[PDB]
Each structure stands twice: as structure tokens, then as C-alpha cells.
């Protein structure tokens, strides 16, 4: 039995420009076992219409999923991805940084 913690990357589909429609991505990878919960957050609040890819895995057997939602970046709004997994003692929040 193995347990591997998710790698989590939060980023946009296209280079972000304030006022231009885009997609916000939370890519969770490298994890085992497969049960995982992922929410996208705007200013701390859960975003409702968030879609995700079908469960698949890499050559090393570890799982990955993409969670995503349409958005329009602005100067004032803060976005984040919140992840829970058995390897985490509490939900992990990773903030969207535009330049990462």
C-alpha cells in the first residue's frame, strides 16, 4: 500500500489579461489513492460550475485530474484551488499566481 500526496498547480489556460475571458485550471497529479476532492475558490468562496477531466494515471501509476472553470481575471479578485486527500491533514489551498 502506497499513499502519495497531490502535486497541485493553479494556472490559466491562456496568459491572463484582466478583462479577457479565460479558464482557471487546477491540475492535481502524482497522487494515490484516487479519491480526491477539489474546489476552485474566488475570494475564498467555492465556485459552483467547475468541470473536471476523467480519472487517468501516469506511467508511474500515480493519478491526475484537471479541474477548470471559465473566468475573467481582474486586478481585485483572488483565486485558489482547495484540495483534500487522505495524505492531507486539512484541505490544502494553493493560490493562483499569474506568473507561475
Amino acid at each position: 500500500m502506497i499513499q502519495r500526496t497531490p502535486k497541485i498547480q493553479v494556472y490559466s489556460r491562456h496568459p491572463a489579461e484582466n478583462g479577457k475571458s479565460n479558464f482557471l485550471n487546477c491540475y492535481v497529479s502524482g497522487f494515490h489513492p484516487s479519491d480526491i476532492e477539489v474546489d476552485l475558490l474566488k475570494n475564498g468562496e467555492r465556485i459552483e460550475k467547475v468541470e473536471h477531466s476523467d480519472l487517468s494515471f501516469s506511467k508511474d501509476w500515480s493519478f491526475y485530474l484537471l479541474y477548470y472553470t471559465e473566468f475573467t481575471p481582474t486586478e481585485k479578485d483572488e483565486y485558489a484551488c482547495r484540495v483534500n486527500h487522505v495524505t492531507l491533514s486539512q484541505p490544502k489551498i494553493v493560490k493562483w499566481d499569474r506568473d507561475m
Binding site: 500500500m1 502506497i2 502519495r4 502535486k7 498547480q9 494556472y11 489556460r13 491562456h14 496568459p15 479558464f23 485550471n25 491540475y27 497529479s29 502524482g30 494515490h32 489513492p33 484516487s34 479519491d35 477531466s53 476523467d54 480519472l55 487517468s56 494515471f57 506511467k59 501509476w61 500515480s62 493519478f63 484537471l66 477548470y68 506568473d99
Partner: protein, 276 residues
């Protein structure tokens, strides 16, 4: 023709806390998912997940559904079997993963097949490269190996991987030609930010590329800096393209001594990029 593959990635999970198990299978051509099956769906069916498979007629959907459902039932049984082989409690959840597929060589001819299984995240049993023999990870897997040797399972896999797998692959490539057969090179850029009083971070980006395979390396005087480089996992954009970056901390004023080297099949020739 080109390098291409068809693969299926299946996950079976026992769920003693729900009194059942779940099977999910996904199909890919190269980096592109095209089908899924999920036993927890209402009316579980093999379902299309790319536009270019949608034109397959009902008999295709019906047949693929019968076969994946069959496979789901067998892998559910296998979970129980393996729990017995390892003498594990009924209480815990376990995972059996399976990946199989075929690979066409740069000439479009069959080069490679594979059929492999992992239990709880570790190799269990794999068809060897010769497609004639099996590698078992441990004494439990040796039980399954003996069964599969006695059933001439390898010979059945050879027939599937040479016939059906390759032929299907080639039909999918035709149907999806406008997306599957053209590579899109990366859009690149190099950023520079002082990161302490001692150092400057150079970051080399590649965005918008497909297929996923790409090489990004920082060099100084023709010499890889891969030890000191931070290299994120390649990540999907969500629209069939991919993203990656690589970063290096360098001495202030020495930025032009470093170049980022990009290799991708969409490029005419590799790129040598500088902070510019």
C-alpha cells in the same frame, strides 16, 4: 506515417465503506482522450469524449460497451482475488490499475505493445516486451502469472495488439486527422526577476504546444544546468495544448551567459532562447 499510440487506462477500486466497487476506463490516441466508461454513471456505457469519435455508429458503442462492461466485471472479481492472495482484511479499500496499448513506429508500422497491472500503486504483473512472457512482481503475482501462462493469455494479447489495436488506431488517426496528425510548436518566452540580492531567476516558458513531449533545458557555455534548474511538471491547458517551464537562479549581470534550449516536434529546428 508517424509515431502514434492507442492506449486504455483502467482503474478498479474496492469500496468497502460503500459495499461495492467502481471501475473507470479511459481511452487515448496519443495525448488525446476519446472515450470513457464509468460504472458509477447512470446507465454505464462507453461514451465519446472527443468530437471525432462521435460519428462511430451504434454497433461500435454497443460492442465497446459490452466489452468494457465485461472487463469491469472481471476486474471487480480480480480485486477480491488479490485481497485473498495478500491475505488482506475486508475493511480496506484497494486499487487495481491496468494500462494496455499499441505503438506505431516512426514508419507507421507496429513497434511495441504493452499490457500491465498495478495493485495499490505498485507493479503487479506485466506483459514483457517480447509479448510472449510475463513479469510478476511478487509471489501473489506469480499465481496470476501461472494462470495466464496456462491460458496462453500472451498469444491472445499478441492477436489483439497486432490486429484490432493497430487497425483501430489507424482508423482513429484518419477520423481525427485535423487534430491528431499535426503538431503545434510551443510559444516561448524568457522572464527575468531578481529573486534575492544574490540572484536573478531566469524562467523559460513553453505554452500552447502539442504533443506533450518537450525538452526545456538551461545551458551555460554549452552545458546543461539540470541539477540547479526547477522544472515543473508538464501540465494541460484544457484545450489539447500543454504548458511547461524551467527556471534557474543565476548571478546578477550574467543573464546573457545562459540560454534555454527547446526541442519539440512542432519546431522546424530546436530553439536557443535568451532573456531579451
Amino acid at each position: 506515417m508517424g509515431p502514434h499510440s492507442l492506449s486504455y487506462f483502467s482503474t478498479a477500486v474496492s469500496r468497502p465503506d460503500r459495499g461495492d466497487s467502481r471501475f473507470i476506463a479511459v481511452g487515448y490516441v496519443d495525448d488525446t482522450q476519446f472515450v470513457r466508461f464509468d460504472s458509477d454513471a447512470p446507465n454505464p456505457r462507453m461514451e465519446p469524449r472527443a468530437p471525432w469519435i462521435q460519428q462511430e455508429g451504434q454497433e461500435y458503442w454497443d460492442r465497446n460497451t459490452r466489452n468494457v462492461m465485461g472487463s469491469a466485471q472481471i476486474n471487480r472479481v480480480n480485486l477480491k482475488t488479490l485481497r485473498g492472495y495478500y491475505n488482506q482484511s475486508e475493511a480496506g479499500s484497494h486499487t487495481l490499475q491496468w494500462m494496455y496499448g499499441c505503438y506505431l513506429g516512426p514508419d507507421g508500422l507496429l513497434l511495441r505493445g504493452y499490457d500491465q497491472f498495478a495493485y495499490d500503486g505498485a507493479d503487479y504483473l506485466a506483459l514483457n516486451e517480447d509479448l510472449r512472457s510475463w513479469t510478476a512482481a511478487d509471489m501473489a503475482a506469480q499465481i496470476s502469472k501461472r494462470k495466464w501462462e496456462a491460458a496462453d493469455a500472451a498469444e491472445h494479447w499478441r492477436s489483439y495488439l497486432q490486429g484490432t489495436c493497430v487497425e483501430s488506431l489507424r482508423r482513429y488517426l484518419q477520423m481525427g486527422k485535423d487534430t491528431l496528425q499535426r503538431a503545434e510548436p510551443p510559444k516561448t518566452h524568457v522572464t527575468r526577476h531578481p529573486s534575492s540580492d544574490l540572484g536573478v531567476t531566469l524562467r523559460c516558458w513553453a505554452l500552447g504546444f502539442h504533443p506533450k513531449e518537450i525538452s526545456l533545458t538551461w545551458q551555460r557555455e554549452g552545458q546543461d544546468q539540470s541539477q540547479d534548474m526547477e522544472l515543473v511538471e508538464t501540465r494541460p491547458s484544457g484545450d489539447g495544448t500543454f504548458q511547461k517551464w524551467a527556471a534557474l537562479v543565476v548571478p546578477p549581470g550574467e543573464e546573457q551567459s545562459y540560454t534555454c534550449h527547446v526541442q519539440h516536434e512542432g519546431l522546424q529546428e530546436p530553439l536557443t532562447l535568451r532573456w531579451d
